[PDB]
Amino acid sequence: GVRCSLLRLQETLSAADRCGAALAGHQLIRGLGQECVLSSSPAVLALQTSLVFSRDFGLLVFVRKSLNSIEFRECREEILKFLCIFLEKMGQKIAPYSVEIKNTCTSVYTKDRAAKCKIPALDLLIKLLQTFRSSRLMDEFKIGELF
Amino acid sequence: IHWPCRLTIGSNLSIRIAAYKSILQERVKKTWTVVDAKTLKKEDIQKETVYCLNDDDETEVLKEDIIQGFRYGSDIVPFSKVDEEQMKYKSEGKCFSVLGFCKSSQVQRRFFMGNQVLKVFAARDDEAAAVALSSLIHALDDLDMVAIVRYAYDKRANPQVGVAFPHIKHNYECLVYVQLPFMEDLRQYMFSSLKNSKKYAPTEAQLNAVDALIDSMSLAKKDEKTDTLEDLFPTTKIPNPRFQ
Amino acid sequence: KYSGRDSLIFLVDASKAMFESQSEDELTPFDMSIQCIQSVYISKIISSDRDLLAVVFYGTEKDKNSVNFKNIYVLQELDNPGAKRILELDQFKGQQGQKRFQDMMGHGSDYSLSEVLWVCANLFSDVQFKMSHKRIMLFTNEDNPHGNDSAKASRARTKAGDLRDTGIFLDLMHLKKPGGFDISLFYRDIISSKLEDLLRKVRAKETRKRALSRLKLKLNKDIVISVGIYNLVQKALKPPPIKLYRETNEPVKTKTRTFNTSTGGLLLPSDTKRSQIYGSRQIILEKEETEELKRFDDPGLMLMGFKPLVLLKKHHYLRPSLFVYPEESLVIGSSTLFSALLIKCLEKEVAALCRYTPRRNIPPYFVALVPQEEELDDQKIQVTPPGFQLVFLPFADDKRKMPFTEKIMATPEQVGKMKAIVEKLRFTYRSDSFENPVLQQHFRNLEALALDLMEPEQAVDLTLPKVEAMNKRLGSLVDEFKELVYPPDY
DNA sequence: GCATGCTCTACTGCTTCGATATCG
DNA sequence: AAGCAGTAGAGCA
DNA sequence: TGCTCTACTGCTTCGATATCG
DNA sequence: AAGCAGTAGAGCATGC
C-alpha cells in the first residue's frame, strides 16, 4: 500500500515522456490521500508518522527533485494541500518532524511561481506556527531570517 | 529648427530643400521627482537592482555575467550585442529620395500611419531650386498624381516609405510628408456583411428617426447669402485641457 | 476558436525513381522536396510559431510506427517547429544526403496502400488539443502508384473517404517528373506544380487577432450601443531582448529595491512621496494625487454633434486610425441601430463627431466617425468590411508655426516636361510586398546563429531606388529640365 | 425545532499576452 | 541612452 | 580686431520599462 | 481581452 506507492512515485519521477508521469503523479498522490485515511488503529498511524518522512525515498525529496520544472503543478500542489491536513488529522506526533517542513514550504514557495502553489503551502506554515505555540522550537525555526 | 536636406530625381535633380514639422502629439515636459517624506530633500534615495539568478536558494551576482539572449522556435539563442552591432543593417545615410509615382490617387485615408506630419517647404537662398520645386508641385496639381518618397532622418532611424501630398495654398505652396505601412504592419480579417443580412434590416420609420436626429443634431449648414459653409462647434480650435 | 492551432503532416514518396536522378542531370526531386520542407519550417518558425508540424517518409525499407506496419517510417512527432528538427532533417540534402538516407533507412520497397493514411489518422488522434486545420502535404511524382491491382485502389479510395469524413484534407504538392503539367490523369477521387508560396513569399509575417477595447457609445443619456474597437494597422517590431546568465545559460530573474535614506535600511511604497520643482518653490503630493489630477470621465463614447464629410482636410491627422464594429454584448438590436445609422450616415454623407475616453482613467479625446461600406466581388474579393472608422483630431499645440512668409512664382515652361516625366515613371501602386529591411535582416541574422550555416544570408531590400535603371528609362532630358530657364552657374 | 447532510450555478479571481504610456 | 548642428571661449595672427 | 579649433547646449532622434485591459 | 477554474452560498430532502 504505502512505500510500494512511494517507490511507484519514485519510478514515476525517474521514467520518460513526462506527461504520463504527470497523470501517474496526480492519481498516485490522490490515491495515497485515500489509502492513508482509512486508518483508525494506533499501529499503522504510529508507523505512518515515520513512514512519510525518510531521506532516501520521501515526500520532501520528491518535492525538491521535481521543483526545477514548469510541468508538475497539480501533483506537488496536491501533496502540499495534503500535508496541511496531515497536521490536523494527526496531532503532535510531528513534533520534531517540522523544521524540515518549514524549510520545505519556504523552498517551494520561494522557487515555484504559480499562486495556486503558494496558497496551500502558506496555509500550512501558518497552521504549523499556530499549533506549535508551545514552549520549544521557536528558536529552532530561524525567525531572524523568516522575518 | 530650419531643416536642410536635398531631394533627388533619378541621376541629378539635386534640389536643396528645407523641411519643418507640423501637427504632432503634444507631451508635457516636467517629470515627477520621487522624494522621501519628512525630510524635503531628494538625495535620500539610492535605488538598486540585483540580477539575481536564484532559481533555488538565492544567489546574487554582479553585473559582468549577462548575455542578451533571444528566443527562437522553442528555445533561447545566445549572442548579445557587439556582434549584432556589427551584423545589423547598415543604413548608408539619410535620404529624401523619390521611388516612383502614380497618377491614380490610390493612397487613401485609412493607411497613413505615422505619428507626425512633415511640411517639406522649398529652398532658401538663391531659390532656383525652390522655383523648380514649385514647378514640380504646379505639375502635380493638375491631376490626382501622387508621389512615393523614401525618408531617413539620420543613420539611426530606420528608413521609411511615405506619400508626399501637394499643398496649393494662398501665400505658401508646400508639400506634406506622411508615412506609410510596410508589409508586416497590415492584417486583413473577414467581418460579416450588413447589407445582405437577412436578420438585422431596419424599418423606414426607424430610418426617418435617424434622419430627424441628424437634421436636428447637424452642425454644418450654409448661410450668409452666398451659401458657403458655416460650421457649429469646430473641434480644432480648443486649447488642450490636460495641461490646463 | 481563438486559441486554436493548425496541423500539417509532410508525407514523402521516396520510392523508385524519385530517388533516381530521373536520368536527368538538371534537378533532383528528393533534394527539391527536402528544400521545400526546410523552407516551410524556416518560415513558420518565426511566422506562426505554435502550429503542429510532422515529417513522415513512406515506401522506406525499414519501419517505425506505433501500430507496427511495414515500409512506413515516421520520423518526428506533432509539435512546434524546432531548431533541432531542422538541424536533424537537413542531413538528407544532395547526393551525400542520398547516400546517408540510404545507409540510415534505405530506399525502395513495395510501398503501402490505405495503411499510410491509417498512420496519419493515428498521428492526429493522439493530440488532445483543438485542431482547426487538418492538411496533408504529399510530395509524390507517380500518378498511378497501384496501376496493377484494383483492390488496393478501391481500399485506398475508401480509406481516403473515411479520412475526408472526419475532417482531414490533403493537397499533394506536385513534383515535376514531366516538368510541365501534362499529367492530366484521373486523380479526382482523393483530392479536394506551383511551389512559389512554399518557396519564397513569407519571410517576415505574423498571425494574431484581438479586440483592444470594448466600449459603449451613448447618444443622449439613455440610448447606449456597444462597439468593439478593433485595430487594423499595428506597427509590428522586434521581440524583447531576454536576459541570460553566462555559464548556466538561463534567465536572470532580476529584482529591485530602494533604500539609503542617509541611514541605509530599506523602504516601502508609503514612506516616499511625489514631487516637482518650479523655479524656486517645491510641490509634494501622493501617488494617488498625481494619478487623480488627470481624471475626467468614464470609459466610452459620447455623441457630440454631426458633420458632413467636407470640412476635414487630410492635412489633419495625428495617430493611426482604429475601426469600430457592432458587437453583441448589449442587446440583439444594437447591430440593427448601427445598420440604420450606417445607411443614413453613408447616403447623406454625414460623419459622427464624438468624445472618446479609452479606459478607466484617461483624459477625453475628440474623434470623428466616418462610415465604410464593404466591397466584395464575384471571386470574393473581400477588401473592405462594413463598419465605422475613427479619425483623430488635433487640439492646440499640435499645430506649430513655420517661418512660412515666402511666396515666389515660377514660369510655365516646365509643366509639360514634368507631365511627361511623371508619365514615364508611372506604375500602378501596390497591394503588398514592401517589406522591412531592419526586421528582415534581423530575421536572417538570427537564422545565422542557431542554424549557423555560413554568414548573414540574403538581404535584398525592396525600398531602394535604382538610379542606373532610372537614367536610361528617363532619357537625356535631365539636362534640359535642369537648365531650360534656370542656370545655377556657381 | 431548528440541527444536519447534500447539490447546482453566478461572482471572484488566474494567467497569458498584446497594447500603451512613459522613462531614459 | 546616444548623436547633432548652431553658439560661443579663447588659441592663433 | 580677424580667423578657427573647440567646448557647449538646447534639441532632437531613438531604446528599454512598468501599466493595464 | 480571452479563456479557465474554483467555490460560496443559497436551495433540495431527512434527523436528537
Swiss-Prot record, chain A:
Signal peptide: none
Function description: Serine/threonine-protein kinase that acts as a molecular sensor for DNA damage. Involved in DNA non-homologous end joining (NHEJ) required for double-strand break (DSB) repair and V(D)J recombination. Must be bound to DNA to express its catalytic properties. Promotes processing of hairpin DNA structures in V(D)J recombination by activation of the hairpin endonuclease artemis (DCLRE1C). Recruited by XRCC5 and XRCC6 to DNA ends and is required to (1) protect and align broken ends of DNA, thereby preventing their degradation, (2) and sequester the DSB for repair by NHEJ.
Species annotation: Homo sapiens
Oligomer and partners: DNA-PK is a heterotrimer of PRKDC and the Ku dimer (composed of XRCC6/Ku70 and XRCC5/Ku86). Formation of this complex may be promoted by interaction with ILF3. Component of the core long-range non-homologous end joining (NHEJ) complex (also named DNA-PK complex) composed of PRKDC, LIG4, XRCC4, XRCC6/Ku70, XRCC5/Ku86 and NHEJ1/XLF. Additional component of the NHEJ complex includes PAXX. Following autophosphorylation, PRKDC dissociates from DNA. Interacts with DNA-PKcs-interacting protein (KIP) with the region upstream the kinase domain.
Domain of life of the organism encoding this protein: Eukaryota
Connected disease: Immunodeficiency 26 with or without neurologic abnormalities: A form of severe combined immunodeficiency characterized by reduced or absent T and B cells, recurrent candidiasis, and lower respiratory tract infections. Some patients show dysmorphic features, severe growth failure, microcephaly, seizures, and impaired neurological functions.
Modified residues (N6-acetyllysine): K111
The protein's name: DNA-dependent protein kinase catalytic subunit
Family: Belongs to the PI3/PI4-kinase family.
Subcellular location: Nucleus; Nucleus, Nucleolus; Cytoplasm, Cytosol
Swiss-Prot record, chain B:
Cellular component terms (Gene Ontology): chromosome, telomeric region; cytosol; DNA-dependent protein kinase complex; DNA-dependent protein kinase-DNA ligase 4 complex; extracellular region; Ku70:Ku80 complex; membrane; nonhomologous end joining complex
Keyword Cytoplasm: no
Domain Ku stretches: 9-208
GO molecular function, one term: transcription cis-regulatory region binding
Post-translational modification: ADP-ribosylated by PARP3. Phosphorylated on serine residues. Phosphorylation by PRKDC may enhance helicase activity.
Modified residues (Phosphoserine): S11, S14, S74
UniProt modified residues of type N6-acetyllysine: K21, K88
Domain notes: The EEXXXDDL motif is required for the interaction with catalytic subunit PRKDC and its recruitment to sites of DNA damage. The VWFA domain interacts with the KBM (Ku-binding motif) found in a number of DNA repair proteins.
Function statement: Single-stranded DNA-dependent ATP-dependent helicase that plays a key role in DNA non-homologous end joining (NHEJ) by recruiting DNA-PK to DNA. Required for double-strand break repair and V(D)J recombination. Also has a role in chromosome translocation. The DNA helicase II complex binds preferentially to fork-like ends of double-stranded DNA in a cell cycle-dependent manner. It works in the 3'-5' direction. During NHEJ, the XRCC5-XRRC6 dimer performs the recognition step: it recognizes and binds to the broken ends of the DNA and protects them from further resection.
Similarity annotation: Belongs to the ku80 family.
Listed name of the protein: X-ray repair cross-complementing protein 5
Native species: Homo sapiens (Human)
Classification of source organism: Eukaryota, Metazoa, Chordata, Craniata, Vertebrata
Swiss-Prot record, chain C:
Catalytic residue positions: K1
Crosslink site: Glycyl lysine isopeptide (Lys-Gly) (interchain with G-Cter in SUMO2): K243, K273
Modified residues (N6-acetyllysine): K1, K273, K287, K294, K417
Record keywords: Acetylation, Activator, ADP-ribosylation, ATP-binding, Chromosome, Cytoplasm, DNA damage, DNA recombination, DNA repair, DNA-binding, Helicase, Host-virus interaction, Hydrolase, Immunity, Innate immunity, Isopeptide bond, Lyase, Methylation, Multifunctional enzyme, Nucleotide-binding, Nucleus, Phosphoprotein, Systemic lupus erythematosus, Transcription, Transcription regulation, Ubl conjugation
UniProt GO molecular function: 5'-deoxyribose-5-phosphate lyase activity; ATP binding; ATP hydrolysis activity; ATP-dependent activity, acting on DNA; cyclin binding; damaged DNA binding; DNA binding; DNA helicase activity
EC identifiers of the protein: 3.6.4.-, 4.2.99.-
Region annotation (DNA-binding) ranges: 233-297
Effect of K1A: Diminishes the ability to form a Schiff base. Abolishes adduct formation
GO aspect biological process, one term: double-strand break repair via classical nonhomologous end joining
Protein purpose: Single-stranded DNA-dependent ATP-dependent helicase that plays a key role in DNA non-homologous end joining (NHEJ) by recruiting DNA-PK to DNA. Required for double-strand break repair and V(D)J recombination. Also has a role in chromosome translocation. Has a role in chromosome translocation. The DNA helicase II complex binds preferentially to fork-like ends of double-stranded DNA in a cell cycle-dependent manner. It works in the 3'-5' direction.
The protein's name in its UniProt record: X-ray repair cross-complementing protein 6
Annotated gene: XRCC6
First and last residues shown, out of full length: 31 to 534 of 609
